[PDB]
Ligand binder design. Structure first.
Ligand SMILES: [Zn+2]
Ligand SMILES: [Zn+2]
Lengths: 110, 665, 101, 151, 96, 138, 98
């Protein structure tokens, strides 16, 4: 046997602000609801954009900052404005879970 | 030599071509002699990797993707054959390859453990071999929403149909094998980065602990995926009706599955106790408090501005520091002159079980989605409402026997299983009057207390700290339940005589040793101690006789060392520590034992602006404690200038002056 | 990034990258003695499209005809090559420090 | 790394004594305290930051001593030959001989005085069982050799 | 001693503006104007090396178009060391 | 019996420096500056009795802004602060840090002593700077 | 005969040094003079009023270690020296003789 030590990830600290940002953003991404110049049935533009990505096998999502600004008193928008570099991985985590739910075809280059 | 390895890998690759493949006429199609090929691969596992203790086939099979690209297609399409036919009813043959595929899945998903007894090849191959099991877990959960899980329950239903009388030993084995499949699929978890320590560390440590292979993310492995795929394949329904049908050959794996669900999830996460965005705003305000605190610990001008403070001490000598804010605040200057030291005292170090609440970081939550939270909580609710008392009676009626051969893993998983659901039903009942404490009544039947006591006593005597810690946790929830049923009302009186003498002594001696062990060990010791004290007070053989066994300096060292983590502890835990101090110091009046400088420093560090939340209830308790503590210390020093030096040291165990130090006449 | 050790065939993977080309400090194999002797696996590792573009202050926004101030913008992935020389553009993204690597 | 060594026609203990004797003795008497001690008094009062050593004065000092019959080792030739070392020697002679100020200068505002005073207090406590500095730190003046006039 | 298969009529074409990360280590077909041609040089193809410690000769490494051969350690003495191209045998290919 | 916070190399007490600056940053009146400068007969109470730096800090706090301009001759016009001028010239970074901290303390203390309600958290979060100018000959 | 061979000298806190005048006798001389606790001040300030003396004294006695490390060494050496035990009991023996 070789002299060695077990180094363990489960004793990590988690960023509670980042996780809560991910929760808020994930919910916003899947269920932000609006429509205009049409029926009142809401389009859910970012879920529909995920479908467009799934059709044209894209790998980016365009987000209007003002839609975040109106969401949840704009607290999420302020957080992402002030400390974007901290929260971008958490936003990717949330986006990945939403894509799993509504377009799991896209989790690979496919 | 590695020539044998390339020969092996070549054989496994050819076998991978023999299993089957897609047909363009797309559908998966089995190969010719497919049953013989599957049997030969099972043979390879036994013939080489088990009998020679290697895991080389277990590696090669992952290299040639047999599980993901043959066996799951076979099982899913066979499930589709049977499920489509079931609405309409050579299956008698294809059933055999489906069974053998499930056998191979149980083999390839078998929980790997490395010990001193594991071979050199095994401990070498362990780290990378774990990664392929994680790929297997991802693929098993994701593929067609995990329809292979429905294939597995169909293979189980095809013996549950024939009676309790009818099922042969082979049928019993097949059902147990399906439970092992579910257990394994839950149980796979990322491996630990096992560094070699022959050669010293460089000027930078390990770059990252992440062990996941590049096609896996931790969200693929998270409980959300397990709960989602299990709900969408009605695995929860299968397990619930299976435990409803318990009227015992399979009881150990079923227990083990419930352990593997519960082992790392906190009960209060399943209860609430714009809302997510509102709470995000609350979080942002909480860290903004830290911003307005660190700002005062920050220079108002650039770092090179560099005005020099000199601290003249009370004596005719001078120190120097560059802190621009420290010029107007000697508090900052003193603690900076302390932090400036290059010296640190050197500090000391310190497997066949998985990670759990036994060893996680104390705040490590699982982030359920709301639907997965609902599905999981309703499943375990229905389990409590149906399966708890019978399953616990079944396994404890076993485990009273064969305690000598109860392997350590089996012990810890059993104790944790008991504790988790007892705690859960207490919480659900404290929330809902509709939920009944007696729905976990099997916990209180004296056979159970006897067994858990035996496990704790034996593990302590054997110095098995792992099972000791788990039995301590189980005792905490048992006493929690006992106090509740004391209020709900005979068994309380019975156990309140059975935990006399040797059990008092043992429970008193856990927090004497606990200061040497991990934070969770100490936390469980403190939790047990608070539970014990409130139980004994609810009873109140003599109260002073028991509590004197706790009020001694090794216990206080455990309490202080636990409280050193106050920034990372939860507010309720600080409340529990300070309630213990409240009893010991204010009520029991052994106040001399807490006049020691470790506590003095710790009190200042948490009462400092860099410490507790200004509006915290625990901050209120620390402030309330500290005013009285300072008053009593002031009194004792006014009555004893010797205690200015005694504050620095352990109090004197030479009783002839020790009594005078303790009370001062 | 992803690297195979020189003295044993074990592989480190999903290695995050700093501004410098970052290689692993420890071998994952508990048998192995290696530090800092590696081969990058080009096939397993993942790259991204990257493009620096230099922008200058708008001619109609300079206050009194002095020199325009300049900035370096990094484009990545699908966003590369949407700029063009002489084009007037609006970007959004992160203001970052880049060390002298 | 070892070195060989040689004898030379110079002795710096002797020339140090010659320099300090000159410094406390000479004055321009034909023009009717010692010139350099008066100038060092002006340095002590911090009214003057430069000491100008005249080789003419060293010549006249040598001529006076030779008229009195003693040898004088031709310090002018020595300090024309190796002037860099003799700046250090003259500064050591000055740092020994220099008198106290006659005029007060609001001394407490001088940082180097404060810091070395604090050092001295701490060293008194140490020496009570409870050089002081590198000399250049305490040397406020600058020293210069003025050449020989043609005569 | 060797033949090179020169692939032709590869169906899909890119411009130099059009190359991306997804093309890395793929076969590509590209059009352009040869702007600057350097001289014709010999380049090492199969190269043995000498360790100055232990038994010197090391087996033939195949040289590529991008990187020098790195010898992290000598296999014969399993240690670091200085190295030189071997004199007993080496072989060259044209380069430009 | 207690430690002393000293501007290093000077023996100047930082408590003394702080209070010498405070008692000018509040309770200075602009009339004193015309006593120092030429044309002293141009003193006029209805324009010069103003608490000049209270006026500055009030307009500054209504604008929420961090910076105060300070003509250094105004220190020499005021008896408890003429020594602070020499300390400012000779030991500037320490004295300027002290003046900055004193401006922040004046802003904090005003909203609890003059006691109009204000965002104490805003002042707590903000840094404050003095800008001494006209220090001496150019 | 043996021309010199080198070795590394080392120093640490020790009971004799801790029993020198600048050790605990300094505490008995100065602690009651310098610490003062009052109901007129909050708990954090009063705790600091204790801590400032002991930190300065610990540094002046033994400037190598941090204050927390100093406290740990004091506790352990106090646990494990007979001379220090005799001195410590002698303090309370003196108070008993009052
Ligand atoms: Zn290696
Ligand atoms: Zn070699």
């Amino acid at each position: 046997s070789f002299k060695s030590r077990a180094l363990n990830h489960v004793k990590k600290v988690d960023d509670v602000t980042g996780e809560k940002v991910r929760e808020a953003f994930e919910q916003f991404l899947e269920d932000f609801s609006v429509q205009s110049t049409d029926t009142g049935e809401v389009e859910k533009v970012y879920r529909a954009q995920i479908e467009f990505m799934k059709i044209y096998d894209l790998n980016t999502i365009y987000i209007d900052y003002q839609h975040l600004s109106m969401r949840e008193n704009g607290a999420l928008a302020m957080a992402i404005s002030e400390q974007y570099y901290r929260f971008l991985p958490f936003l990717q985590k949330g986006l990945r879970r939403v894509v799993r739910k509504y377009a799991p075809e896209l989790l690979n280059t496919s | 030599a590695d020539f044998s390895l390339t020969v092996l890998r070549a054989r496994i690759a050819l076998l991978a071509t023999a299993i089957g493949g897609p047909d363009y006429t797309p559908p998966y199609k089995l190969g010719d002699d497919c049953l013989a090929c599957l049997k030969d691969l099972k043979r390879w596992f036994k013939l080489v990797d088990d009998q020679q203790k290697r895991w080389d086939v277990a590696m090669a099979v992952a290299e040639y993707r047999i599980l993901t690209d043959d066996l799951l297609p076979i099982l899913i399409d066979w499930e589709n054959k049977c499920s489509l036919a079931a609405k309409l009813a050579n299956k008698a043959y294809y059933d055999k390859i489906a069974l053998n595929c499930l056998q191979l899945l149980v083999l390839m998903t078998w929980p790997l453990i490395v010990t001193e007894q594991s071979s050199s090849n095994q401990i070498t191959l362990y780290g990378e071999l774990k990664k392929h099991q994680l790929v297997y877990k991802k693929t098993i959960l994701s593929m067609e929403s995990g329809k292979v899980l429905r294939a597995a329950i169909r293979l189980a239903l095809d013996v549950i149909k024939i009676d309790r009388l009818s099922r042969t030993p082979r049928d019993n084995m097949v059902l147990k094998l399906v439970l092992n499949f579910f257990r394994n699929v839950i149980a796979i978890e990322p491996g630990e980065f096992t560094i070699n320590t022959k050669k010293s560390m460089p000027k930078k440590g390990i770059t990252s602990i992440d062990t996941l292979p590049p096609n896996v993310s931790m969200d693929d492995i998270s409980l959300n995926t397990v709960i989602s795929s299990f709900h969408k394949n009605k695995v929860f329904g299968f397990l619930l009706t299976l435990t409803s049908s318990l009227s015992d050959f399979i009881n150990i794996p079923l227990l083990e599955i419930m352990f593997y669900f519960t082992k790392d999830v906190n009960q209060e996460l399943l209860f609430p106790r714009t809302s997510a965005g509102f709470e995000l705003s609350k979080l942002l305000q909480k860290e903004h408090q830290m911003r307005k605190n660190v700002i005062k610990h920050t220079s108002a001008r650039h770092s090179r501005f560099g005005g020099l403070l000199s601290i003249q001490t009370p004596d005719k000598t001078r120190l120097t520091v560059s802190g621009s804010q420290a010029l107007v605040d000697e508090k900052i200057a003193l603690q900076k002159l302390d932090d400036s030291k290059k010296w640190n005292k050197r500090i000391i170090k310190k497997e066949g079980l998985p990670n759990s609440l036994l060893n996680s970081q104390t705040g490590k939550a699982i982030f359920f989605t709301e639907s997965n939270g609902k599905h999981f909580k309703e499943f375990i609710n229905n389990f409590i409402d149906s399966g708890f008392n019978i399953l616990l009676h079944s396994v404890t009626n076993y485990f009273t026997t064969e305690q000598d051969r109860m392997v350590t893993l089996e012990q810890v998983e059993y104790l944790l299983f008991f504790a988790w659901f007892v705690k859960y039903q207490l919480l659900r009942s404290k929330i809902d009057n509709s939920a009944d404490i007696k729905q976990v009544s099997e916990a209180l039947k004296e056979v159970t207390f006897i067994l858990v006591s035996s496990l704790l006593r034996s593990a302590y005597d054997l110095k098995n700290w792992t099972v000791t810690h788990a039995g301590m946790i189980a005792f905490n929830e048992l006493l929690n339940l006992v106090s509740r049923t004391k209020a709900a009302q005979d068994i309380e009186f019975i156990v309140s005589r059975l935990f006399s003498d040797e059990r008092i002594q043992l429970l008193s001696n856990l927090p004497k040793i606990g200061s040497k062990y991990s934070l969770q060990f100490m936390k469980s010791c403190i939790e047990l101690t608070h539970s014990v004290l409130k139980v004994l007070e609810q009873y109140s053989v003599n109260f002073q006789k028991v509590q004197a066994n706790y009020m001694t300096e090794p216990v206080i060292e455990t309490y202080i060392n636990f409280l050193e983590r106050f920034r990372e502890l939860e507010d309720d835990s600080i409340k529990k520590v300070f309630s213990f101090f409240h009893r010991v110091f204010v009520q029991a009046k052994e106040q001399a034992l807490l006049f020691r400088f470790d506590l003095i420093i710790l009190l200042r560090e948490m009462l400092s602006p860099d410490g507790l939340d200004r509006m915290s209830r625990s901050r209120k308790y620390v402030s309330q404690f500290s005013d009285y503590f300072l008053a009593r210390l002031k009194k004792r020093l006014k009555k004893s200038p010797a205690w200015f030096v005694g504050l620095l040291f352990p109090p004197l165990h030479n009783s002839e002056v020790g009594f005078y130090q303790r009370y001062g006449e | 990034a992803s690297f195979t050790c020189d003295m044993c065939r074990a592989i480190v993977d999903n290695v995050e990258q700093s501004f410098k080309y970052t290689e692993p400090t420890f071998c994952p194999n508990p048998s192995c003695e290696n530090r800092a002797f590696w081969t990058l696996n080009v096939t397993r590792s993942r790259f991204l499209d990257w493009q620096k573009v230099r922008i200058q202050e708008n001619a109609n926004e300079i206050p009194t005809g002095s020199m325009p101030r300049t900035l370096d913008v990094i484009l990545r992935g699908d966003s590369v090559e949407r700029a063009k020389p002489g084009d007037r553009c609006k970007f959004t993204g992160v203001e970052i420090v880049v060390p002298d690597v | 790394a070892a070195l060989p060594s040689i004898q030379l026609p110079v002795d710096y203990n002797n020339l140090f004594n010659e320099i300090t004797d000159f410094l406390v003795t000479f004055k321009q008497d034909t023009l009717s305290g010692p010139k350099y001690m008066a100038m060092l008094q002006k340095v002590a009062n911090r009214e003057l930051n430069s000491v100008i050593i005249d080789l003419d004065d060293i010549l006249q000092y040598q001529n006076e001593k030779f008229l009195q019959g003693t040898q004088a080792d031709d310090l002018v030739s020595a300090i024309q030959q190796n002037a860099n070392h003799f700046t250090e020697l003259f500064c050591r002679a000055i740092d020994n001989n220099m008198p106290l100020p006659t005029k007060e200068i609001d001394y407490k505002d001088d940082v180097l005085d404060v810091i070395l005073n604090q050092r001295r207090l701490r060293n008194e406590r140490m020496l009570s069982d409870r050089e002081l500095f590198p000399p250049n730190l305490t040397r406020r003046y600058f020293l210069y050799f003025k050449p020989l006039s043609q005569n | 001693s060797e033949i090179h298969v020169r692939i032709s009529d590869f169906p899909t074409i890119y411009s130099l503006r059009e190359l991306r990360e997804s093309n890395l280590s793929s076969l590509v077909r590209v059009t352009g104007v040869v702007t600057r041609r350097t001289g014709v040089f010999p380049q090492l193809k199969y190269v043995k090396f000498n360790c100055l410690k232990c038994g010197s000769i090391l087996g033939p490494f195949f040289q590529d178009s991008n990187e020098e051969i790195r010898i992290s350690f000598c296999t014969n003495c399993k240690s670091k060391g200085p190295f030189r191209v071997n004199g007993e045998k080496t072989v060259y290919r044209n380069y430009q | 019996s207690e430690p002393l916070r000293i501007i290093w190399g000077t023996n100047v007490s930082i408590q003394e420096c702080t209070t010498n600056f405070r008692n000018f940053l509040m309770s200075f009146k602009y009339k004193f500056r015309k006593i120092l400068d030429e044309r002293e007969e141009f003193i006029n109470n209805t324009t010069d009795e103003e608490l000049y730096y209270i006026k500055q800090l009030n307009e500054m706090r209504e604008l929420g802004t961090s910076n105060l301009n300070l003509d250094a001759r105004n220190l020499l016009a005021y008896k408890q602060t003429e020594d602070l001028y020499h300390q400012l010239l000779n030991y500037p970074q320490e004295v300027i840090s002290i003046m900055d901290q004193t401006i922040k303390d004046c802003m904090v203390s005003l909203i609890v002593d003059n006691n109009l309600d204000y965002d104490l958290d805003e002042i707590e979060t903000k840094f404050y700077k003095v800008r001494p100018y006209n220090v001496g000959s150019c | 005969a043996i021309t010199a061979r080198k070795r590394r000298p080392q120093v640490k806190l020790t009971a004799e040094k801790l029993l020198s005048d600048k050790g605990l006798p300094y505490v008995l001389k100065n602690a009651h003079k310098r610490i003062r606790i009052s109901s007129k001040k909050n708990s954090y300030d009063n705790l600091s009023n204790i801590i400032q003396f002991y930190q300065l004294w610990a540094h002046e006695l033994f400037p190598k270690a941090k204050f927390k490390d100093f406290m740990k060494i004091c506790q352990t050496v106090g646990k494990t020296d007979p001379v220090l035990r005799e001195y410590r009991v002698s303090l309370f023996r003196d108070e008993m003789g009052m």
